[PDB]
Amino acid sequence: ERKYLELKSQKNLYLARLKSAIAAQKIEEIAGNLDNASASSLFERIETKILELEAERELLNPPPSPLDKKFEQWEEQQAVEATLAAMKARRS
Amino acid sequence: QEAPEDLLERLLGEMELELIELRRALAQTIATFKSTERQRDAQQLIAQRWYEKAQAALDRGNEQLAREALGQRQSYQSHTEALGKSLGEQRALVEQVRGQLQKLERKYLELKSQKNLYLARLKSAIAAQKIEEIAGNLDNASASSLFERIETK
Amino acid sequence: ILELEAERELLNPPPSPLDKKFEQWEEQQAVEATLAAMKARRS
Amino acid sequence: AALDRGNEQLAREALGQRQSYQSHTEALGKSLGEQRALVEQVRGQLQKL
Ligand SMILES: Nc1ncnc2c1ncn2[C@@H]1O[C@H](COP(=O)(O)OP(=O)(O)O)[C@@H](O)[C@H]1O
Ligand SMILES: Nc1ncnc2c1ncn2[C@@H]1O[C@H](COP(=O)(O)OP(=O)(O)O)[C@@H](O)[C@H]1O
User: Which residues does ligand 2 sit against, CB inside 6 Å?
Assistant: First the structure.
């Protein structure tokens, strides 16, 4: 009788310790550590899936050249300079 | 396999259920520990009562009954020591289990604080990619863009 | 009963005894200051 | 008036008794300080609607 009571007084603690360890392990496989980049952590798999689509839609419709960006920026600067100069000069 | 985003939410819900299950199991563990502590206290109380009875029995001057009572209380003292030994380790173990649960809680909260941002970024990107296949570019003329197919038709 | 009493304690941690000591000392400081000034005001 | 007999024990008891009421008063004063600030914003929303 006493032996059985003693064993029943420990089954619960052992179950709790097993469950805590299982949950602790199951935490890792989702995120783990930020610097993993292991493609096993579910966040990196989402990140690669994002970048794949972002590049795939870029291939179909090419982005404008940096030369075009420089040209349009300079055109905007020339425009605003002309407006400000004539705008100061009109009230004068 | 399946799309990662749906299994992300499914796994997070399952993890929530497992966490509350762990909380309940730890509650039962601390309950049983308290019960064992109470039983140890009761046993030592009974041993003290037997010692007190022997104290009054010795007043007669017949030491034989005192010897009988003192030999009787030895088993109870041994049982009290046996339970005191086990408590000395169960108390040190439950604290570490509680610490593990406390850390897991914060980790889960942190992951749930980012699932939404990741889903929003995924939806924005897929919509941005889908915007193209209808029209794309005015000079695209790929016959895949739905406007050029209508124009040729 | 004990299971529920511990389970609701896990969800909302009780304060550490250090906080209890601190608040007890704060109460003692308050009562001593009040009684000292309270004696000294009529004097 | 309790300290008037010259025995400070009753004064100590009364001062220890009033501490709970002071704490409760402060607890309610903390909550009023935010409820008053929130009801005004709700009223403004209603007025604009
Ligand atoms: N301390 C650490 N810092 C950064 N990354 C780590 C660290 N420890 C492990 N990793 C990551 O773990 C990954 C290896 O896991 P992986 O090879 O994907 O698992 P499997 O072998 O099951 O495919 C590496 O990409 C590495 O970035
Ligand atoms: N910068 C651009 N200016 C004009 N048209 C472009 C540009 N980039 C891509 N295209 C268009 O993309 C089209 C090619 O797509 P297409 O070969 O029909 O797709 P798929 O390979 O799926 O059949 C070409 O007709 C071309 O006009």
Answer: A 62; B 137, 139-144
Which residues from chain A sit within 8 angstroms of residue B100, using beta carbons?
20, 24
Gyration radius (Cα) of chain C, Å = 18
Decide if B100 and A20 are in contact by the 8 Å CB cutoff: yes
Angle of CA points B134, B138, B143, to nearest 5°: 55
Method by which the model was determined: cryo-EM
The bound ligand whose nearest atom lies closest to the alpha carbon of B132 is 2
Q: For chain A, what is the HEC assignment? A: CHHHHHHHHHHHHHHHHHHHHHHHHHHHCCCCCCCCCCCCCHHHHHHHHHHHHHHHHHHHCCCCCHHHHHHHHHHHHHHHHHHHHHHHHHHC
CB contact under 8 A, B29 and A31: no
State how far the Cα of C19 lies from the Cα of C28, in Å rounded to an integer.
Answer: 14
A35 carries a ligand binding annotation: yes
Half-sphere exposure (Cβ direction) of A48: Cα atoms closer than 13 Å: 10
Q: Note whether B149 and B143 are within 8 A (CB).
A: yes
**Rounded CA gap, D16 and B97, in Å?**
41
Cα–Cα distance between C5 and C33 in angstroms, integer?
Answer: 39
Q: How far apart are the first and last CA of chain C?
A: 56
8-state DSSP, B58: G
State the distance between the two ends of chain B, measured CA to CA, in whole angstroms. Answer: 40
Q: Report whether B136 contacts A60 (CB < 8 A).
A: yes
Q: How many helices (H) and strands (E) does chain C have?
A: 2, 0
CB atoms within 10 A of CB B55: 11
**What is the maximal distance between C-alpha atoms in chain D?**
66
